[PDB]
Amino acid sequence: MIQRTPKIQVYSRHPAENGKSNFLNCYVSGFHPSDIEVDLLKNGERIEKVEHSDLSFSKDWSFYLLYYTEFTPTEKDEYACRVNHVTLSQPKIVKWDRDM
Amino acid sequence: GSHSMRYFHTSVSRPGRGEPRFITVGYVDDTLFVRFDSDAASPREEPRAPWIEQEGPEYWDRETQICKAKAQTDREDLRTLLRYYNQSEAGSHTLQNMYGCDVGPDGRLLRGYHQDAYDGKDYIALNEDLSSWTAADTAAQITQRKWEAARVAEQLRAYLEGECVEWLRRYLENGKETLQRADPPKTHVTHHPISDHEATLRCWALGFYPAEITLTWQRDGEDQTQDTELVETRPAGDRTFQKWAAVVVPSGEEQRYTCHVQHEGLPKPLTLRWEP
Amino acid sequence: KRWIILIVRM
């Protein structure tokens, strides 16, 4: 059994402007097997209505998924993606950084 | 330009939790246009792009039957592969299948594809000649001889040269407003101080379609390949894609560095600098 | 437009 750990990017659909509606994205890719758990977090807490793309895979058979939710960024609110996979001893948290 | 159509299929067994989950999606270029999920309430193949919605109900009936039939054959193949590999019935395993065709600007077949993977490893693949197979191991050689005896490649070849190319050309005509429009990237350079002696230059490319793109940093006109951080091209969620390339530069050296952007939607390859 | 064998088993 080969196992490949997911790459993770957290980012917005549009350039973040405080007060303006946007989309928060968590893109997990390059992983196998396909079971994975992805939460989008607002100030440490799980956002309730997150949609995700249908499971698909790349040329090397590794899987990728897009989790996304509508949000309105502000200066104080912190956002993050939380990922768990069989390859990870503990859930990995990646913070949202509007410059990445 | 050149175009592609692809159908992707995944089956994942889950012993003690029902029958294997089956998910298949169809793409033209980097545009998703159909999906089927075995765990949906009333599973049917569903449109995911506007230009496929015009297909009539018997298109959707036949497509749904094919997805359901494929879901069943994957379940049998997963049990088969447990035997071929002397594996326990207690673990979860994965079967993946991809097939499709590439066509050139004049709409003729450039090449076809049909390949399978078991647990994320190559298993058997139709060769580019569309008549012979490459099996990855002795288990896959069993399948290869079954498939040679049934003449599967002859039927795949007929499909890949016939309907695959013909229906791709149809989809390209019906969705030409989007499938035949390249969206160029919006590009800029950002500056992020690290310390007194170093800063990051980040070159951005936003809102582009299709996903193929090249971003390079040069210093004194020489590629900074080994020292450039390059994130994977990622989906924006609105059909377009994003990418950035970054490089750490000594402070005061910023103008030795140039970012180079090539995208099929750009007349000329762009060159960008940072300016405060 | 999808393909199906007009069965193929591994």
Q: What is the DSSP string of chain B?
A: --EEEEEEEEEE--TTSSSPEEEEEEEETTEEEEEEETTSSS---EE-SGGGTTS-HHHHHHHHHHHHHHHHHHHHHHHHHHHHTT--TTS--EEEEEEEEEE-TTS-EEEEEEEEEETTEEEEEE-TTSS-EEESSHHHHHHHHHHHHHTHHHHHHHHIIIIIHHHHHHHHHHTHHHHT-PBPPEEEEEEEE-SSSEEEEEEEEEEEBSS--EEEEEETTEE-GGGEEEPPPEE-SSS-EEEEEEEEEETT-GGGEEEEEE-TT-SS-EEE----
Paired sense of beta strands B234-235 and B241-250, if any: antiparallel
By Cβ distance, the residue of B96, B192, B231 closest to A9 is B231
Question: Phi, psi at residue B13, to the nearest 5°?
Answer: -75, 155
Closest Cα of chain A to B193: distance in Å? 12
The domain tally of chain A equals 1
Residue of A nearest to B230 (CA): A100
Structure tokens that stand for A75 in this block:
């200066």
Residue B28 CA, chain-centre distance (Å), reads: 10
Length of chain C: 10
Contact A43, A24 (CB under 8 A): no
Residue of B nearest to A67 (CA): B237
Chain C contact set for B164 (CB, 8 A):
1, 3
CB C4 to CB B7 under 8 A?
Answer: no
Measured distance CA(B186)–CA(B212) in Å, rounded: 14
Record the resolution, in angstroms. 2.2
From residue A45, give the alpha-carbon distance in Å to each of A26, A66, A93, B184, B245.
Answer: 15, 19, 12, 37, 31
Residue B120, Cβ density class (10 Å: 0-12 exposed, 13-18 middle, ≥19 buried): buried
Peptide bond into B185 cis (omega under 30): no
Question: Phi, psi at residue B252, to the nearest 5°?
Answer: 85, -5
Of B263, B255, B250, B150, give the one whose Cα is nearest residue B212.
B263
Q: For the stretch B44-62, what's the b/e string if a residue is b when 16 or more beta carbons lie within 10 angstroms of its beta carbon?
A: ebbebbebbeebeeeebee
Interface subset of C 1-10, CB within 8 angstroms of B:
1-10
For residue C10, the one-letter residue type is M
Q: Which helix (H) or strand (E) holds A84?
A: strand A79-84
Measured distance CA(A95)–CA(A26) in Å, rounded: 10
DSSP A32: B
> What kind of experiment solved this structure?
X-ray
Residue B68, Cβ density class (10 Å: 0-12 exposed, 13-18 middle, ≥19 buried): middle
By Cβ distance, the residue of A4, A34, A100 closest to B12 is A34
CB B234 to CB A9 under 8 A?
Answer: yes
Residue B185, Cβ density class (10 Å: 0-12 exposed, 13-18 middle, ≥19 buried): buried
Chain B meets chain A (3+ C-beta pairs below 8 A): yes
Measured distance CA(B141)–CA(B152) in Å, rounded: 14
Given CB atoms, is B94 within the 8 Å cutoff of chain A? yes
Measured distance CA(B239)–CA(B241) in Å, rounded: 7
Residues 6+ apart with CB under 8 A from B11: B20, B21, B22, B71, B74, B75, B77, B78, B94, B95, B96
Length of chain A: 100
With an 8 Å Cβ cutoff, the interface of chain B facing chain C consists of 7, 26, 63, 66-67, 69-70, 73, 76-77, 80-81, 84, 99, 116, 143, 146-147, 150, 152, 155-156, 159, 163-164, 166-167
Q: Which residues pair with B246 in a beta bridge?
A: B202, B229
Chain C meets chain A (3+ C-beta pairs below 8 A): no
Structure tokens that stand for A58 in this block:
């790349």
Measured distance CA(B261)–CA(B189) in Å, rounded: 12
Closest Cα of chain B to A44: distance in Å? 24
CB A25 to CB B120 under 8 A?
Answer: no
Closest Cα of chain A to B120: distance in Å? 6
Measured distance CA(B165)–CA(B99) in Å, rounded: 12
Measured distance CA(B129)–CA(B191) in Å, rounded: 50
Structure tokens that stand for A86 in this block:
């069989």
For residue B28, the one-letter residue type is V
Measured distance CA(B189)–CA(B202) in Å, rounded: 6
Contact B122, B115 (CB under 8 A): yes
User: Which chains, if any, share at least 3 CB pairs under 8 A with chain B?
Assistant: A, C
Structure tokens that stand for A28 in this block:
């997990």
Interface subset of A 29-58, CB within 8 angstroms of B:
29-30, 32-35, 53-57
Tokens 């951080």 map to which residue? B229
By Cβ distance, the residue of A9, A32, A53 closest to B120 is A32
Domain containing residue A31? 1-100
DSSP A54: P
Q: For the stretch B150-160, what's the b/e string if a residue is b when 16 or more beta carbons lie within 10 angstroms of its beta carbon?
A: eebbeebbebb
CB B236 to CB A27 under 8 A?
Answer: no
Residue B71, Cβ density class (10 Å: 0-12 exposed, 13-18 middle, ≥19 buried): buried
Q: For the stretch B190-200, what's the b/e string if a residue is b when 16 or more beta carbons lie within 10 angstroms of its beta carbon?
A: eeeeeeeeebe
Q: What is the largest CA-CA distance in chain B?
A: 70
How many CB atoms are closer than 10 A to CB A99?
Answer: 12
By Cβ distance, the residue of C2, C6, C7 closest to B73 is C7
For chain C, strand residue ranges (E) read none
Contact B166, B213 (CB under 8 A): no
